[PDB]
Amino acid sequence: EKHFKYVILGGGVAAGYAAREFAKQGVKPGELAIISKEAVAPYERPALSKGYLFPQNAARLPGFHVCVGSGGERLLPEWYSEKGIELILSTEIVKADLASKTLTSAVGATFTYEILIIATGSSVIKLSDFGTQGADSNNILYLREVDDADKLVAAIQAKKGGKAVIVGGGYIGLELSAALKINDFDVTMVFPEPWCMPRLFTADIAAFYESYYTNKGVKIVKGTVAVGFDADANGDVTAVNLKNGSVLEADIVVVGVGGRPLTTLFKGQVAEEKGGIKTDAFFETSVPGVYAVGDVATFPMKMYNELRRVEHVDHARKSAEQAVKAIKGKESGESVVEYDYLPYFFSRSFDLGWQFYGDNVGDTILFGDSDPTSAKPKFGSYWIKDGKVLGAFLEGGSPDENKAIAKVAKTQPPVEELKKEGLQFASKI
Ligand SMILES: Cc1cc2nc3c(=O)[nH]c(=O)nc-3n(C[C@H](O)[C@H](O)[C@H](O)COP(=O)(O)OP(=O)(O)OC[C@H]3O[C@@H](n4cnc5c(N)ncnc54)[C@H](O)[C@@H]3O)c2cc1C
Ligand SMILES: NC(=O)c1ccc[n+]([C@@H]2O[C@H](COP(=O)([O-])OP(=O)(O)OC[C@H]3O[C@@H](n4cnc5c(N)ncnc54)[C@H](O)[C@@H]3O)[C@@H](O)[C@H]2O)c1
Ligand SMILES: O=C1O[C@H]([C@@H](O)CO)C(O)=C1O
């Protein structure tokens, strides 16, 4: 049995950034452990669908450990022991007793905390969860964690010049379709929605990304779903059967059909809401000295006066810091400012990349060009509700331009021929 004042449960983005803030706020050797089922120190998960997958000059660990991702220092394993932070790796926690402030591994081992941070992130939805016929075949791969990414790199090696099917039109599908395409696959994307990223992209924005993908050789199948997979004698996938009756041959299938907060260790013991562990503006759960951060938290969103959950890296980094800042700033009394999150989301693929700040509500306008034959494409969109601008999106922006639209989203300036001098409106705020 081991005892620590501070236990982080999860070896991910929030955990790494929590650790860095622990060290900034003067934590003393032996006081803090991070417990993780992964076999490596925390890292910048976004790299797994991008740089990790390049055919040359690829991100590899220890390169992308936190906090490089945001311009910070790179925390390698030796950083942690050097500071007496305990990296407890290859360790799945299967039982969590908030009552005893006690955690039990899979090996039966036992761990106590005074102060717990919950950063167990999100699961991957698998087609096997649904009982889909043949979803258990080989080379049907998911991508959450670096071992998944190493399995994806090996199948890419073994199957080059073959056929890839990407099941899903969210973030994963977008990036993984591009990455497979860059690694010399014939790629088809499959998804049921009217157009990709429908939770963020308008019809206009989606049509751009769809033409560009089409122009790059990616085939897109919409309005349907994978209802099953054929396999060969060895059990390797050979095709994807669709609900519309077509069959798509395949050597690799990559599925990105969403994620859920990894909260099962705590069902009952903590107030939940919108799928996540409910928290206040400091990331403390219903249970005193128990914190929840990153993808798992539902927390108050001051600036839209609402409870929200978000599944995004910027937020994992900051909520981790917030919680650490709220712990130490009650240890020594004083006071801490509440979390004030400006939503910030982004993605990159091929030569493209975009940013979104704010809330995607009310009516939209596009601006800039816009043309799928480049170059380099530079357009955006403003979301206007109640006269004010509420959200903005920008593809191919410079840093000045990106600070600009962020400043707009934060300030919510009012109104209207915005479509003439559109990017320009953001710079005059
Ligand atoms: C491939 C990919 C790309 C992404 N790209 C972007 C992007 O470009 N931009 C963006 O904004 N967001 C992106 N995200 C979103 C995501 O929010 C961040 O990647 C981030 O990881 C969230 O961090 P977290 O700490 O909350 O959870 P995680 O980083 O997932 O950390 C959870 C850690 O806890 C461990 N764990 C979980 N449960 C247990 C348990 N019961 N016992 C022991 N250990 C456990 C897990 O193994 C993991 O180590 C991406 C996500 C993925 C998967
Ligand atoms: N840039 C980024 O922000 C980024 C990049 C990669 C991953 N991620 C994160 O990783 C997690 C997983 O992402 P994801 O793209 O897998 O989920 P997502 O929630 O982004 O995508 C959900 C999509 O899956 C599709 N889908 C759902 N059920 C389906 C089915 N039965 N058949 C076919 N398609 C189906 C839908 O069209 C939907 O748009 C999320 O937390 C996400 O935020 C984020
Ligand atoms: O700007 C970003 O891109 C990186 C990613 O590739 C990791 O290095 C990341 O996480 C960001 O916040």
Short mmCIF file of C-alpha atoms and ligand atoms in Angstrom, two decimals, residues 13 17 43-52 59 63-65 67-71 313-314 317 344 346 348 355, ligand 3:
data_model
loop_
_atom_site.label_atom_id
_atom_site.label_comp_id
_atom_site.label_asym_id
_atom_site.label_seq_id
_atom_site.Cartn_x
_atom_site.Cartn_y
_atom_site.Cartn_z
CA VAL A 13 -3.05 15.58 -21.26
CA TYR A 17 -0.43 19.74 -17.27
CA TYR A 43 1.85 13.30 -23.92
CA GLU A 44 0.06 15.58 -26.42
CA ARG A 45 -2.60 13.29 -27.76
CA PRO A 46 -3.46 15.48 -30.82
CA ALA A 47 -0.23 14.39 -32.43
CA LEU A 48 -1.53 10.83 -32.80
CA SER A 49 -3.84 11.64 -35.76
CA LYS A 50 -1.34 14.08 -37.33
CA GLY A 51 2.49 13.83 -36.99
CA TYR A 52 2.51 10.41 -35.52
CA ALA A 59 6.39 12.48 -34.28
CA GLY A 63 9.27 14.02 -28.72
CA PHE A 64 5.63 15.00 -28.04
CA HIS A 65 5.40 14.53 -24.28
CA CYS A 67 3.92 20.47 -22.48
CA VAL A 68 5.51 21.12 -25.96
CA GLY A 69 2.03 21.17 -27.44
CA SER A 70 1.35 24.65 -26.08
CA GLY A 71 4.97 25.97 -26.23
CA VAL A 313 -7.15 19.65 -25.74
CA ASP A 314 -7.09 23.34 -24.90
CA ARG A 317 -4.66 21.73 -20.33
CA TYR A 344 -11.10 26.88 -28.77
CA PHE A 346 -8.92 23.34 -34.23
CA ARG A 348 -5.28 20.16 -39.47
CA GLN A 355 -9.50 27.49 -35.87
O1 LIG B 3 -1.21 23.56 -31.63
C1 LIG B 3 -1.29 22.36 -31.44
O2 LIG B 3 -0.81 21.25 -32.28
C2 LIG B 3 -0.34 20.31 -31.28
C3 LIG B 3 -0.18 18.78 -31.50
O3 LIG B 3 0.36 18.33 -32.76
C4 LIG B 3 0.74 18.20 -30.41
O4 LIG B 3 2.13 18.56 -30.59
C5 LIG B 3 -1.34 20.58 -30.17
O5 LIG B 3 -1.72 19.72 -29.32
C6 LIG B 3 -1.76 21.81 -30.18
O6 LIG B 3 -2.38 22.44 -29.21
#
